[PDB]
Amino acid sequence: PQITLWKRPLVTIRIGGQLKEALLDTGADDTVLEEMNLPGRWKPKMIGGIGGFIKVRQYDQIPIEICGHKAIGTVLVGPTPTNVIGRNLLTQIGCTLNF
Amino acid sequence: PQITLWKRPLVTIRIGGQLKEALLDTGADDTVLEEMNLPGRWKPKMIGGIGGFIKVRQYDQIPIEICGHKAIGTVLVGPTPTNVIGRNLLTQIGCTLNF
Ligand SMILES: CC(C)CN(C[C@@H](O)[C@H](Cc1ccccc1)NC(=O)O[C@H]1CCOC1)S(=O)(=O)c1ccc(N)cc1
Numbered sequence: 001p002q003i004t005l006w007k008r009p010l011v012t013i014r015i016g017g018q019l020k021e022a023l024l025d026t027g028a029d030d031t032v033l034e035e036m037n038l039p040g041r042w043k044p045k046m047i048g049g050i051g052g053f054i055k056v057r058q059y060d061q062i063p064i065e066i067c068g069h070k071a072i073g074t075v076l077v078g079p080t081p082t083n084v085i086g087r088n089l090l091t092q093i094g095c096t097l098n099f
Numbered sequence: 100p101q102i103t104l105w106k107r108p109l110v111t112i113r114i115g116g117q118l119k120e121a122l123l124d125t126g127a128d129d130t131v132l133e134e135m136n137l138p139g140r141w142k143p144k145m146i147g148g149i150g151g152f153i154k155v156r157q158y159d160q161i162p163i164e165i166c167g168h169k170a171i172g173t174v175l176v177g178p179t180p181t182n183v184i185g186r187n188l189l190t191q192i193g194c195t196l197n198f
Pocket residue numbers: 023025026027028029030031032047048049050051084086124126127128129130131146147148149175179180181183185
């Protein structure tokens with residue numbers, strides 16, 4: 001599907017039988033989700049945003065469905081103002097910018 | 100043009116005779132550029148993201164050239180780690196997301 005940008009590019013994602021809303025963010029290198037419980041061994045990590053660095057929990061090889069498109073990769077969970085799908089998963093579903 | 104996301108979507112932008120590298124960011128509602136002395140009246144503002152908030156100066160009606168594409172709109176100037184071209188300007192040059 002082709003998405004215009006007059007509105008926030010929000011999509012419904014499915015992760016762990018749960019349905020959440022997330023923003024397709026080409027400005028984020030990684031995928032960062034709001035606090036939630038994911039299964040598996042996670043490792044502490046720190047990422048930097050526009051306002052500074054935060055601590056997050058890193059989960060590897062996580063299956064996530066983005067508008068019916070399957071991706072399997074790294075997902076960071078922590079204090080983000082909103083769920084964002086970064087380039088690590090966008091590239092998996094073949095997302096590109098056009099103009 | 101078609102930009103893939105294997106790497107950061109960096110592009111060349113022209114502002115006030117100055118050419119800079121900026122990120123095409125569908126995740127940014129508004130454009131935010133690193134500190135620079137732009138002429139004109141401006142309004143103080145606080146924007147937040149990962150890590151918290153930063154104070155920026157809002158300028159309106161600023162002419163910008165994104166990869167040879169003419170655009171004119173609001174621009175936020177402050178201590179941002181990275182220059183970001185947001186949806187406000189992305190919609191102007193007809194940029195879309197595809198997959
Ligand atoms: C989705 C959230 C974070 C909100 N914004 C968009 C994001 O794309 C933002 C862009 C950015 C990249 C690198 C350094 C600094 C900023 N990336 C971000 O945090 O990347 C992290 C998450 C994983 O990988 C790296 S924002 O920058 O706060 C923002 C908010 C308001 C305006 N008006 C303009 C920009």
